[PDB]
From Swiss-Prot:
Main location: nucleus
Subunit structure: Interacts with isoform 1 of VRK2. Interacts (via its D domain) with its substrates MAPK8/JNK1, MAPK9/JNK2 and MAPK10/JNK3. Interacts (via its DVD domain) with MAP3Ks activators like MAP3K5/ASK1 and MAP3K1/MEKK1. Interacts with MAPK8IP1/JIP1, MAPK8IP2/JIP2 and MAPK8IP3/JIP3 scaffold proteins. Interacts with RASSF7, the interaction promotes phosphorylation. Found in a complex with SH3RF1, RAC1, MAP3K11/MLK3, MAPK8IP1/JIP1 and MAPK8/JNK1. Found in a complex with SH3RF1, RAC2, MAP3K7/TAK1, MAPK8IP1/JIP1, MAPK8/JNK1 and MAPK9/JNK2.
Enzyme nomenclature, EC number: 2.7.12.2
Protein name per UniProt: Dual specificity mitogen-activated protein kinase kinase 7
Source organism of this protein record: Homo sapiens (Human)
Gene name of this polypeptide: MAP2K7
Domain Protein kinase: 19-265
From-to range in the entire protein, with total length: 102 to 402 of 419
Length: 287
């Protein structure tokens, strides 16, 4: 159904003219996203705008992302859709895109992200990927820090499913078996998460000084997997978790049900980490 806004738990009958445009948001990865204010209540939401005369290749990825979002309404680690508006020339999609991606948090910190923050981030992203495969048979195919969102209340969610498959991504985070496939990609997203954790924990992308896309894939296959350094005070569980996701042989790479039993995961499922306070202090460093 269209023409409804469900901010929180209250459903409001609304149209596009009931929202005030406050300017553009992000980089326009999937499509043009607006920061808008609902005049009836005062809430600020993110609204995608898909034009029927727009690029048909971009419009296909927008509808594919929306399809996965709509059927993932019962997973708390995936961004939610608040409503849709269908006019004769546009489609407006109200989503939970408020907050900052992990890539922009890295640029503002100008340094490593603390382990206690990456622990809660790992739990949310692994459970989101495990939900997609078990309940829908979907693989993400593009796990990277720019697709990991954090908000004011300390929530962490996956967002972009534009190229998700029902069983190509950035070359920097491509698993070895997606570069050199034998004869199988259920665990390629696990490798992408491992590279993302190394990049955020150190503030440096592991495959450095590559000037072309093909050079990155060469070093993924030719060199040993980039491991977590041992002189930054990282716990033994964190180093053990990263080493498991970064197993080059995908047959020996652990499974989601096996990863969800790791001591690193079980620790931050129960540990109380104030992600909201850490988020506000990093956001309060204007640059």
């Amino acid at each position: 159904q269209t023409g409804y806004l469900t901010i929180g738990g209250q459903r409001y009958q609304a149209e596009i003219n009931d929202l005030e445009n406050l300017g553009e948001m992000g980089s326009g990865t999937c499509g043009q996203v607006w920061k808008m204010r609902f005049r009836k209540t005062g809430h600020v939401i993110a609204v995608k705008q898909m034009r029927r005369s727009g690029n048909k290749e971009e419009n296909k990825r927008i509808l594919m992302d929306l399809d996965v979002v709509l059927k993932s309404h019962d997973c708390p680690y995936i961004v939610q859709c608040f409503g849709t508006f269908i006019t004769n020339t546009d489609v407006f999609i109200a989503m939970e895109l408020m907050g900052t991606c992990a890539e922009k948090l890295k640029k503002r910190m100008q340094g490593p992200i603390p382990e206690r923050i990456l622990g809660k981030m790992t739990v949310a992203i692994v459970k989101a990927l495990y939900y997609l495969k078990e309940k829908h048979g979907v693989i993400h195919r593009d796990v990277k820090p720019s697709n990991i969102l954090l908000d004011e209340r300390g929530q962490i969610k996956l967002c972009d499913f534009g190229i998700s498959g029902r069983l190509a991504g950035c070359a920097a985070y491509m698993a070895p078996e997606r570069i050199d496939p034998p004869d199988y990609d259920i665990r390629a997203d696990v490798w992408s998460l491992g590279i993302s954790l190394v990049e955020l924990a150190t503030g440096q992308f592991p495959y450095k000084n590559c000037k072309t896309d093909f050079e990155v894939l060469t070093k993924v296959l030719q060199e040993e997997p980039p491991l977590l350094p041992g002189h930054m005070g990282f716990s033994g569980d964190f180093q053990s978790f990263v080493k498991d996701c970064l197993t080059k042989d995908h047959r020996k790479r652990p499974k989601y049900n096996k990863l969800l039993e790791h001591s690193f995961i079980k620790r931050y499922e129960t540990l109380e980490v104030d992600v909201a306070s850490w988020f506000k202090d990093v956001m309060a460093k204007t640059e």
